[PDB]
């Protein structure tokens, strides 16, 4: 019985505990570096097991996630970039 001026359907595959991670005002590697839901979130998330399409014999590694960002992620912002995280004071560009 509700009307929305717009609807955004953000989709991604994530681990089990990381579902409890995704919520308005949470913390952790995903809640801070990969997906930060805004505190005044008007919307809601959906999660169900997909062990048949994201799994196969010999394993699968197609998916990715970031644990090294220079700061926290502002809500609803993508940070797709491959830059080596600086540790200490040496750039060590090009090589891990």
């Amino acid at each position: 019985d509700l009307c929305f001026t717009n609807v955004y359907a953000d989709s991604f595959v994530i681990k089990g505990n990381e579902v409890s991670q995704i919520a308005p005002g949470q913390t952790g590697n995903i809640a801070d570096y990969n997906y930060k839901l805004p505190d005044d979130f008007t919307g809601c998330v959906i999660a169900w097991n997909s062990n048949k399409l994201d799994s196969k014999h010999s394993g699968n590694y197609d998916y990715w996630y970031r644990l090294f960002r220079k700061s926290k992620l502002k809500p609803f912002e993508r940070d797709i970039s491959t830059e080596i995280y600086q540790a200490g004071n040496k750039p060590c560009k090009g090589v891990k």
Partner: protein
């Protein structure tokens, strides 16, 4: 020294240290930590320095 100990004791007998006469920069804290849980209550970790 606090984060590079070798024998962090058990929870039943928790090691207790004191920090005084310092300049406390937590960048070195962020360095030696593949963090899993930084839930901070009293202060905001971003606004900590």
């Amino acid at each position: 020294e606090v984060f590079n100990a070798t024998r962090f004791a058990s929870v039943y007998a928790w090691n207790r240290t004191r920090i005084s006469n310092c300049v406390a920069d937590y960048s070195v804290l962020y360095n030696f930590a593949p963090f899993f849980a930084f839930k901070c209550y009293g202060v905001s970790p971003t606004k900590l320095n």
